[PDB]
From Swiss-Prot:
Homohexamer. Transmembrane segments: none annotated. Keywords: Isomerase, Isoprene biosynthesis, Magnesium, Metal-binding, Multifunctional enzyme, Transferase. The gene is PvCPS. Residues 202-261 are annotated as: Substrate binding. Bifunctional terpene synthase that possesses both prenyltransferase and type II terpene cyclase activity, converting isopentenyl diphosphate (IPP) and dimethylallyl diphosphate (DMAPP) into geranylgeranyl diphosphate (GGPP) and further converting GGPP into copalyl diphosphate, respectively. The chain holds residues 6 to 544 of 963 of the full protein. This is Copalyl diphosphate synthase. It comes from Talaromyces verruculosus (Penicillium verruculosum).
Amino acid sequence: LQESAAALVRQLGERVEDRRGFGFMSPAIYDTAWVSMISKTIDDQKTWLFAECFQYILSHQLEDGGWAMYASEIDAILNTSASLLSLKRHLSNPYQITSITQEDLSARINRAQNALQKLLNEWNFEILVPALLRYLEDEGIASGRERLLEIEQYLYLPIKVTALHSLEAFIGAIEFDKVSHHKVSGAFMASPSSTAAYMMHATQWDDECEDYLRHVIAHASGGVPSAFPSTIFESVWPLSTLLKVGYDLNSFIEKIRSYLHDAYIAEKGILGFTPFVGADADDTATTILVLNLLNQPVSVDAMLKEFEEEHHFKTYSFSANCNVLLALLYSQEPSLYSAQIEKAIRFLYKQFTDSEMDVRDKWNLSPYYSWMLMTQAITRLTTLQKTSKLSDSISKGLISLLFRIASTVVKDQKSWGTRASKEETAYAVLILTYAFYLDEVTESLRHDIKIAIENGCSFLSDSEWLWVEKVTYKSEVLSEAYILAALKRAADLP
């Protein structure tokens, strides 16, 4: 149990020696579609740099002509459109890739065209779909996207933005030689698709970007992931998930905790999913929790005065708030940050009351995830209040909300999830292992909670596209972490 938990610490620890970083995100057809379009001038001859990505795109085409739907129709539309654009590009300029012809590729293009036509006729994300449609229409093939995907240059400054992850959607007008300064370890916000667009449309070829892309292709999970490296995210999300349920792994974790401490020191406490790629409230708060529960106190003020606003915590609206709440509740003196703890626990309750107990969580695609985080925070607050470590109507509402969550979850048991995913099942059973100890829960409700926990842990004992991203991705470390955390937390039940 703890050895498997330690393995996650070691897996982050073993990747510390790697200078580029670590990667646990699954490849996304969108990104490798953008990497398959890279052409390099070698010996005065233009050749496609990465034919393995082109083969990856060719091998993922479905019978209908489209690509994988993953978790949302936007995923299918994006993968199909990017892959079909790549097919058009390689039809126009086959160069040195003789695997595909000018007729088989034309047949593939027609199939993908009809598939995307069907998808658009069924469709009623924001900047990736219209951009892909424009790119496809510039190379043949005729409300749609232009009913909601029209809400909306700011990349020449050294300040990093989230558009460095989706730069491939701005090929129409962008000075990539100007964005070349936005290069860390040869990357562009760790997004292979953005670096692929850069290398395609850079005036001056950068061998460093080619080396980074080769590292990604040969060290990811030809298909490239959405973000690479993903060191801090894939290192601290498992550790925090294991630590919050009380996994004891302090004593190969040394190389992971030391690297995380170094990342905290260099990044001034605010950490993204990788070094020098940004900072999200969830990521930094989770890393702070990991350091605090790994016998190394770090002041939460580093993220507190970066990701705190009125009545809620920002993210650069639920997952960040609850992760910050959990980080605060596990600090050295949770009574000192009582104001922000109350702020978060009130904001989440208000959101639940205003959303009919149905709310999502930015990073994940399962409401079970939000219910799990809320149950964790509520039960930690209750335990602190009972033990007097942390000091009326709001509390009664919180207890009633936890009871309603427990009852609705019990009624929502299928085994859990709408797609038979272990992550959603783990979230749903973790939303009940913290609702089992409520003193206001009746005997029948408690029995139902125990039965649902048993039936969820049976399902638990593995990665599905539940983690949002330009294209939703599945990470093995996240799934394993939540499974282990739920199993241990249920094992703590009387």
